[PDB]
Recover the amino acids of this structure.
């Protein structure tokens, strides 16, 4: 009788460990679901797995929520999302020196860092890019920096997180494209968790209504740069 | 076998009638659910009632969807919302001449136009305001203009709609307060329509992904002034 939350804890600021990776699990999503869990009156047990096994871990019932999941028609068929609680916009980031990559269409025939088992990996593959698989967003970016790849497609959130922690690197990159729309991020439960979904929804609304959402989002993102979703009424 | 959508058709640009109130039902929400309906492969039958009976009409099974419903904890207990498809921010509007209404707390002991049977009506009443009940947002505004009331709390959407249709009337007001957050607006179905909800959700995602949402929202609101929700991925 706890909320079994899957993550991979190497993705600041969503889900990372304090004290330079050595301490307790922390992050925007983590504090949120933990916050969610407390009001729902439930202990939380985490399970850190690699992203490539994340959804697996949910089909295979080894936990009940995933966090930081982009809403997708594909997933919306097979799963239940909570209400969106944050949004990302997907950037095509390159080295500032970069020349010929001006849109996603241009990723064909260039070398790209994407995280194996992610839609952006499947995208980069579709475009007939040359994939170099990273184990999270820090490495995706470090690979771009190390000339090992020419580009990566990464959300705004991790990528501006990176410009914070490592600010001298905030000049060594550039955004050469973003997606037309931004994308909703929601918790993801197996289909049928109808009951648990709505509770999450109610508590998220409470968390919005009483200032909590604002404290939590404020602890992690720059309000001028990352997009929140709408709040609740009453 | 059709999607029974309740509305009140005197609320531009959400749900109004073409040709100055003489023609077919039209509006942002209306086109959307109609659009939703077509993809879900369903005719749509409308039912115009007054706002005060709207939720009644849904408890009483005389229709299956309400549109332009603000999410609230209260309603989220008793109903199913779709994913949010737009947001409003609630303005405290007064005559430009006004001086002493600087916040919601200041509505106590002044005379307010709100629409009977609405949360904002219940708000104005709680604050110990002096209520003068309007039929819709146009009259609530016209009552403010006619000195019959000192203020109204109204969403941004209707109120900027009004400044559009009637630009000669659009300098004679001012915003003396808005709420902390903006609020999510969603379709509202009876509890249990679990299946229909998710479908609406899938189609809303499709409607986002392929530019539809953008055409529809563009026909009705100013993108710089009204808030959209986040889009979908893929
Ligand atoms: O549809 C999309 N457009 C995208 C544009 C950019 C990046 C991903 C994008 N996706 C999805 C790609 C795969 N994914 C798997 C779930 C894990 C989720 C997560 C993250 C951290 C955590 F702790 C627990 C669960 C996650 C989110 C972003 C990721 F890059 C990788 C994995 C969800 C998002
Ligand atoms: O939560 C909120 N904040 C508010 C600020 C002002 C007034 C009401 C506000 N309510 C609720 C109050 C009552 N109500 C019942 C249905 C009317 C609904 C509607 C309108 C037109 C239509 F065609 C179908 C259904 C509606 C939705 C948004 C509005 F701005 C006004 C009325 C739902 C929204």
């Amino acid at each position: 009788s706890a909320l079994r939350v899957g993550t991979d804890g190497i993705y600041p600021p969503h889900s990372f460990h304090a004290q330079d990776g050595r301490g307790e699990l922390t992050g925007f999503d983590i504090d949120l679901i933990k916050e969610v869990a407390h009001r729902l009156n439930l202990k939380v047990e985490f399970f850190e797995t690699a992203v490539s096994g994340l959804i697996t871990g949910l089909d295979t019932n080894r936990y009940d929520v995933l966090v930081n999941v982009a809403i997708t028609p594909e997933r919306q068929k097979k799963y239940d999302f909570s209400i969106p609680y944050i949004a990302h916009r997907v950037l095509l980031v390159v080295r500032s020196d970069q020349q010929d990559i001006r849109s996603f269409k241009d990723l064909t025939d260039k070398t790209v860092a994407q995280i194996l088992g992610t839609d952006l990996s499947r995208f980069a593959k579709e475009l007939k890019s040359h994939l170099v698989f990273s184990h999270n967003f820090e490495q995706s970016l470090q690979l771009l920096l190390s000339k090992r790849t020419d580009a990566t497609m990464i959300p705004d959130i991790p990528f501006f997180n990176f410009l914070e922690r490592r600010p001298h690197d905030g000049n060594l990159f550039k955004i050469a494209d973003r997606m037309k729309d931004n994308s909703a991020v929601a918790f993801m439960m197996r289909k049928g968790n109808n009951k648990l979904t709505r509770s999450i929804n109610e508590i998220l609304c409470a968390i919005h209504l009483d200032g909590t959402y604002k404290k939590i989002f404020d602890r992690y993102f720059d309000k001028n740069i990352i997009s929140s979703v709408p709040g609740c009424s009453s």
Q: What stands out?
A: Chain A is about 30% helix and 25% strand.
